[PDB]
Design an enzyme around this catalytic site. Structure first.
Site, mmCIF file in Angstrom:
data_model
loop_
_atom_site.group_PDB
_atom_site.id
_atom_site.type_symbol
_atom_site.label_atom_id
_atom_site.label_comp_id
_atom_site.label_asym_id
_atom_site.label_seq_id
_atom_site.Cartn_x
_atom_site.Cartn_y
_atom_site.Cartn_z
ATOM 1 N N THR A 1 -2.400 6.763 9.780
ATOM 2 C CA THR A 1 -3.392 7.106 8.774
ATOM 3 C C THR A 1 -3.714 5.843 7.969
ATOM 4 O OG1 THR A 1 -1.854 7.739 7.038
ATOM 5 C CG2 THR A 1 -2.619 9.515 8.503
ATOM 6 N N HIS B 1 7.990 6.747 4.153
ATOM 7 C CA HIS B 1 7.157 6.242 3.066
ATOM 8 C C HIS B 1 6.429 7.470 2.489
ATOM 9 C CE1 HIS B 1 4.479 6.071 6.562
ATOM 10 N NE2 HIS B 1 3.607 6.576 5.703
ATOM 11 N N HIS C 1 0.818 -1.215 0.000
ATOM 12 C CA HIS C 1 0.000 0.000 0.000
ATOM 13 C C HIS C 1 0.852 1.266 0.000
ATOM 14 C CE1 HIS C 1 0.992 0.335 4.277
ATOM 15 N NE2 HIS C 1 0.775 -0.971 4.268
ATOM 16 N N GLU D 1 -2.164 13.743 2.235
ATOM 17 C CA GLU D 1 -3.115 13.301 3.268
ATOM 18 C C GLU D 1 -3.594 14.526 4.037
ATOM 19 O OE1 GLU D 1 -1.488 9.650 5.289
ATOM 20 O OE2 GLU D 1 -3.111 8.907 3.968
ATOM 21 N N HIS E 1 2.729 9.029 0.349
ATOM 22 C CA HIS E 1 1.359 8.902 -0.152
ATOM 23 C C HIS E 1 1.250 9.755 -1.412
ATOM 24 C CE1 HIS E 1 0.062 7.061 3.693
ATOM 25 N NE2 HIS E 1 1.041 7.785 4.139
ATOM 26 N N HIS F 1 6.164 10.824 4.842
ATOM 27 C CA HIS F 1 6.035 10.567 6.298
ATOM 28 C C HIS F 1 7.341 9.962 6.800
ATOM 29 C CE1 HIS F 1 1.395 10.606 5.992
ATOM 30 N NE2 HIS F 1 1.951 11.797 6.030
HETATM 31 C C1 LIG Z 1 1.528 -0.786 13.322
HETATM 32 C C2 LIG Z 1 2.106 -1.298 11.986
HETATM 33 O O1 LIG Z 1 2.886 -0.244 11.261
HETATM 34 C C3 LIG Z 1 2.320 0.955 10.845
HETATM 35 C C4 LIG Z 1 0.950 0.944 10.579
HETATM 36 C C5 LIG Z 1 0.312 2.089 10.069
HETATM 37 C C6 LIG Z 1 1.151 3.231 9.942
HETATM 38 N N1 LIG Z 1 0.707 4.416 9.452
HETATM 39 C C7 LIG Z 1 1.686 5.314 9.396
HETATM 40 S S1 LIG Z 1 1.462 6.976 8.851
HETATM 41 N N2 LIG Z 1 0.839 6.947 7.415
HETATM 42 O O2 LIG Z 1 2.748 7.561 8.906
HETATM 43 O O3 LIG Z 1 0.482 7.557 9.805
HETATM 44 S S2 LIG Z 1 3.176 4.728 9.874
HETATM 45 C C8 LIG Z 1 2.525 3.223 10.157
HETATM 46 C C9 LIG Z 1 3.179 2.076 10.669
HETATM 47 ZN ZN LIG Z 2 1.960 7.717 5.947
#
Ligand SMILES: CCOc1ccc2nc(S(N)(=O)=O)sc2c1
Ligand SMILES: [Zn+2]
Length: 257
Positions: free
Chosen positions: A195, A91, A61, A103, A93, A116
Site C-alpha cells: 500500500t 508497522h 513514513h 487503510e 498506519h 500490518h
Molecule cells: C519493497 C520495500 O519494502 C516495502 C515496501 C512497501 C510496503 N508496503 C507494505 S504494506 N503497507 O504492509 O502493504 S509492507 C512494505 C514493504
Molecule cells: Zn502497511
C-alpha cells in the site's frame, strides 16, 4: 519523493509508480454483505512463540519493528496460504483524528489505525525475491479502535520518543507480538498489493474481523512522530494511509459465516 502531503500524496504516486493504477491494488473497502463465505478456507496458524525482535525504526513514513527472519522463528501458515511465511516486520498506519487512520475500511467504516504484520514466502529465499512474485507476501491486517488500553502495545509506545525523526532507530529486543492479536482469528482475504511504493501486486491480504482496542493516549503518542529528519522543519507524522482502491475483478472471501 513520495509522501502523504498535498503535493506528493497518494493521488500523485502513479506518475512514478504507474502500477498504482493496477488491477489488484490495495487497500480496498470490504463490503461485508458481498464477501463470500468460503468453507474451504482453513483457520490461520500463527506461530510467534519464538519471535526475535531486533530493532524499531522511523523510516520516514511509518515506524516499523523488525524481526530476525533468517530462520522459521515466527511464521504464518494456514488460512488461504500455501507454504510457510516468515515475519519480517510490523508497522502501523494512523490518522490525525480518531475517525480516520485505517487503510482498509469495512462497509465504509474507518478505524483509528491499522497494524500490518508483514510476512514473506520462504520458498523465494529472501524478501526482495518474494516481492516480485504474485504469492510472495502475506500481510496480516488488524484494525485499532479507540477505547481501552492495549497493555501489549505499551512497550512500543514508550520507545517512540527515541525515534522521533526519520532515520532514527533503537534496539528493540524481546518484544512479543502475540500481545497485539485479538481474541478471534476470523478473517477476510483477497489478493492485493503493497500500500506504499513500490505498490507491487505481491500480497495475499488477511484482514482480521475483530479490532483491538487502544487508548486515546496510546494513539496520541503515534501522532507525535515526525516525517522529517532531525534539524528539518517539523511535520507531524499523521494520516499516513492510502485511499481505498477499486476492487475491479476481485472477490473478497470470508472465513466465517
Ligand atoms: C519493497 C520495500 O519494502 C516495502 C515496501 C512497501 C510496503 N508496503 C507494505 S504494506 N503497507 O504492509 O502493504 S509492507 C512494505 C514493504
Ligand atoms: Zn502497511
Amino acid at each position: 519523493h513520495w509522501g502523504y502531503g498535498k503535493h506528493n500524496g497518494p493521488e500523485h504516486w502513479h506518475k512514478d509508480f504507474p502500477i498504482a493504477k493496477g488491477e489488484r491494488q490495495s487497500p480496498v473497502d470490504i463490503d461485508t454483505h458481498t464477501a463470500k463465505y468460503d468453507p474451504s478456507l482453513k483457520p490461520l496458524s500463527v506461530s510467534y512463540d519464538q519471535a526475535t525482535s531486533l530493532r524499531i525504526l522511523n523510516n520516514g513514513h511509518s515506524f516499523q519493528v523488525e524481526f530476525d527472519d533468517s530462520q522459521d522463528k515466527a511464521v504464518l501458515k494456514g488460512g488461504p496460504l500455501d507454504g510457510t511465511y516468515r515475519l519480517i516486520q510490523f508497522h502501523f498506519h494512523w490518522g490525525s483524528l480518531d475517525g480516520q487512520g485505517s487503510e482498509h475500511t469495512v462497509d465504509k467504516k474507518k478505524y483509528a489505525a491499522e497494524l500490518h504484520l508483514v510476512h514473506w514466502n520462504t520458498k523465494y529465499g529472501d524478501f526482495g525475491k518474494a516481492v516480485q512474485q504474485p504469492d510472495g507476501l502475506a500481510v496480516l491486517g488488524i484494525f485499532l479502535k479507540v477505547g481501552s488500553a492495549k497493555p501489549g502495545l505499551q512497550k512500543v509506545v514508550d520507545v517512540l520518543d527515541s525515534i522521533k525523526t526519520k532515520g532514527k532507530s533503537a534496539d528493540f529486543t524481546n518484544f512479543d507480538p502475540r500481545g497485539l492479536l485479538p481474541e478471534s482469528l476470523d478473517y477476510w482475504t483477497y489478493p492485493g498489493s503493497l500500500t506504499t511504493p513500490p505498490l507491487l501486486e505481491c500480497v495475499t491480504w488477511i484482514v482480521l474481523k475483530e479490532p483491538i482496542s487502544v487508548s486515546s493516549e496510546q494513539v496520541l503518542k503515534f501522532r507525535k512522530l515526525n516525517f522529517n529528519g532531525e534539524g528539518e522543519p517539523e511535520e507531524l507524522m499523521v494520516d499516513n494511509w492510502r485511499p481505498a482502491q477499486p476492487l475491479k475483478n476481485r472477490q473478497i472471501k470470508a472465513s466465517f459465516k
